[PDB]
């Protein structure tokens, strides 16, 4: 369809205001092609011409599916811009109209609806909730109520997974509980599909739903997804591992019972890889996740010890991107506050002291507190064995006492107080 390439807004306007369905169809397409263009589409001008309500109106024209499609795509691309732009689409009454198109017998039109609502719900909490109130969930889910997901078109299914992922998304407030209960079974099903794009976005959805209080985490863990998450944590595709790791990391911010499910599912065996992973953010989120495990019970710290992960933490503490080192410190401090003397001794035999001391050269004043708190905890463990002195010497060897003395004169008070305490108490 070559006539519609590169119109002006005023010509699009001329076309849409004729009482000629077909002229309106060409104009709309020309408008879509403007908004489809790669470089700075004139979203704000289309809005300013007053075209949205006309577009929305075109969504309702069952008798002329091509105009439905084109208005869909046009609106979809307006709703894909800024919040103001999405708002203009919502203010035209697009939501109920797009929901109405979900049952459309033309798959390509149904799919556009799905995409539009995706963009609308993705703006934030309010519009997400508004899409839900308008009743989008029953029709979205009905489009996936089939025996085998594999019969659906590749793109259609990716689109639906992505849109559902946006209905699970954002966090102030979290999505209505009943809407999450309604979505999860289908979501769980998608999380076992073999298309990596579907898996990524399922994992994102799960990561969003687990980003919150323990009750939210529980409704996800209840559905038995932890084993499948752990499996996905081992995928080759980074866009799957990334969200899978986030979900696991979220889940272990919850109760120790909830953490245990991930340990039971085999998670810890993947961490040697993750804690060494070349993508810096994976390494960061892996170490973060470790810290919320070392924050747990002693039998859970043992599982960390038995999987040979303490040396990996010593490793990350010794050399990693700084933000990861920071989580490494936390993971050690958590370990050290909740551990047994035997577990804290092991930590030192794995060589934690030297690299822990090297991080007191850091300019970040919060890390120094974490580290210093760890030291105290470790002394507290040597004080119960009579080997406080051996540790003191050990901290001399690597030049740690040198650094602690200089931190006795740090500006932050919580610092220089913890410093002073240590020097006098053990040196």
């Amino acid at each position: 369809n070559q006539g519609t390439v590169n119109w002006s807004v005023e010509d699009i306007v001329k076309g849409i205001n004729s009482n000629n369905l077909e002229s309106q169809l060409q104009a709309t397409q020309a408008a879509r092609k403007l908004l489809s263009r790669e470089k700075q589409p004139p979203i704000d001008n289309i809005i300013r011409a007053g075209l949205i309500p006309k577009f929305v109106s075109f969504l309702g024209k069952t008798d002329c599916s091509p105009i439905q499609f084109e208005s869909a795509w046009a609106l979809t691309n307006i709703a894909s811009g800024t919040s103001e732009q999405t708002k203009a689409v919502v203010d035209g009454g697009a939501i109920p109209a797009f929901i109405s198109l979900l049952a459309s017998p033309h798959a390509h039109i149904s799919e556009q609806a799905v995409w539009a609502l995706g963009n609308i719900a993705g703006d934030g909490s309010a519009f997400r909730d508004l899409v839900i109130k308008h009743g989008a969930i029953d029709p979205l889910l009905a489009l996936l109520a089939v025996p085998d997901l594999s019969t659906l078109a590749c793109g259609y299914l990716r689109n639906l997974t992505w849109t559902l992922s946006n209905l699970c998304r954002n966090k102030n407030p979290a999505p209505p509980l009943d809407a999450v209960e309604q979505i999860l079974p289908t979501l769980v099903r998608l999380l076992h599909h073999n298309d990596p794009e579907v898996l990524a976005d399922s994992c994102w959805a799960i990561s969003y739903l687990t980003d919150g209080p323990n009750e939210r985490i529980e409704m996800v863990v209840k559905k038995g997804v932890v084993p499948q998450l752990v499996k996905l944590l081992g995928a080759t595709e980074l866009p799957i591992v990334t969200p899978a790791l986030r979900a696991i990391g979220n889940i272990v911010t919850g109760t120790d019972e909830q953490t245990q499910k991930v340990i039971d599912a085999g998670a810890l065996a993947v961490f040697p890889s993750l804690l060494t992973n070349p993508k810096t953010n994976i390494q960061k989120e892996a170490t973060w996740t470790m810290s919320n495990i070392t924050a747990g019970r002693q039998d859970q710290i043992q599982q960390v010890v038995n999987h040979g992960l303490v040396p990996f933490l010593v490793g990350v503490l010794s050399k990693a991107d700084f933000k990861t080192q920071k989580e490494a410190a936390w993971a050690i401090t958590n370990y050290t506050s909740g551990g047994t003397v035997e577990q804290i001794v092991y930590l030192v035999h794995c060589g934690i002291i030297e690299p822990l001391m090297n991080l007191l050269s850091a300019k970040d004043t919060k890390i120094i507190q974490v580290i210093l708190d760890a030291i105290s905890n470790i002394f507290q463990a040597a004080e119960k064995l009579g080997e406080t002195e051996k540790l003191s010497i050990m901290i001399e060897e690597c030049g740690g006492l040198d650094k602690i003395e200089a931190l006795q004169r740090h500006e932050n008070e919580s610092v220089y107080k913890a410093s002073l305490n240590l020097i006098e108490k053990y040196f």
Binding site: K33, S36, R37, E38, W73, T76, N77, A79, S80, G81, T86, Q112, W115, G118, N119, G122, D123, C154, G155, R158, W162, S165, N166, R169, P196, E197, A200, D201, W204, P239, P243
Partner: peptide, 15 residues
Amino acid sequence: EAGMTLGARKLKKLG
């Protein structure tokens, strides 16, 4: 067919 959404809030439909 590739096309990873990454975690994107909004998706523009290209021509």
